[PDB]
UniProtKB/Swiss-Prot annotation, chain B:
Subunit structure as annotated in this protein's UniProt entry: Component of the GATOR2 subcomplex, composed of MIOS, SEC13, SEH1L, WDR24 and WDR59. The GATOR2 complex interacts with CASTOR1 and CASTOR2; the interaction is negatively regulated by arginine. CASTOR1 and CASTOR2 convey leucine availability via direct interaction with MIOS. The GATOR2 complex interacts with SESN1, SESN2 and SESN3; the interaction is negatively regulated by amino acids.
Localization in the cell: Lysosome membrane
Protein name: GATOR2 complex protein MIOS
Role noted for this protein: As a component of the GATOR2 complex, functions as an activator of the amino acid-sensing branch of the mTORC1 signaling pathway. The GATOR2 complex indirectly activates mTORC1 through the inhibition of the GATOR1 subcomplex. GATOR2 probably acts as an E3 ubiquitin-protein ligase toward GATOR1. In the presence of abundant amino acids, the GATOR2 complex mediates ubiquitination of the NPRL2 core component of the GATOR1 complex, leading to GATOR1 inactivation. In the absence of amino acids, GATOR2 is inhibited, activating the GATOR1 complex.
Similarity section: Belongs to the WD repeat mio family.
Lineage: Eukaryota, Metazoa, Chordata, Craniata, Vertebrata
Length: 140, 59
């Protein structure tokens, strides 16, 4: 199920989820001609692709980090149940690179249905997965 | 089989291949202390990680 999400703190940044995840930026095109490689979102609006990522095949659930740093940070839960934290911004000064690429694997292989971040505390992630035989379905 | 490759046209850029592929850059550290997150390649050499990629499992 493809979906589009805006940046929590940036009004010009968006992400579209598919077999490849595309992070794009919005620019004005009223006084300028159609830029090369820019998608005419509207009559006077242009969207320029910022990054492309093919690191998540068969993506199931997608969420975006709440905190400002790092920028363009998302969490993707796959069909196998692995939830991987990825980044798409040009961040050469990541505050904590140890969390970059961090993956959580379920004890029992099951499909993750939904994933979300806690608004009050950005360090808490709640994920609901498929129904196991005798195991918990929601993990925080 | 992990391997390291240099940039064909850049002398300061290298790539290391593993389960995650890491592209790093080389900087001097003779007159400066150990930079945060920089790997001391030599006594006076420092390598700063440029990018990390997990897009190729079982490379």
């Amino acid at each position: 199920k493809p979906d589009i999400l805006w940046a929590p703190h940036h009004v010009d940044r968006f992400v579209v989820c598919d077999s490849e995840l595309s992070l794009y930026h919005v620019e004005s095109t009223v006084n300028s001609e159609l830029k090369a490689g820019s998608l005419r979102l509207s009559e006077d609006s242009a969207a320029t692709l910022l990054s492309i990522n093919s690191d998540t095949p068969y993506m199931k659930c997608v969420a975006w980090y709440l905190n400002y740093d790092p920028e363009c940070l998302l969490a993707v839960g796959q069909a196998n149940g692995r939830v991987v934290l990825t980044s798409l911004g040009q961040d050469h000064n990541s505050k904590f690179k140890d969390l970059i690429g961090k993956e959580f694997v379920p004890k029992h292989a099951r499909q993750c249905n939904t994933l979300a971040w806690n608004p009050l505390d950005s360090n808490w992630l709640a994920a609901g997965l498929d129904k196991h035989r005798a195991d918990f379905s929601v993990l925080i």
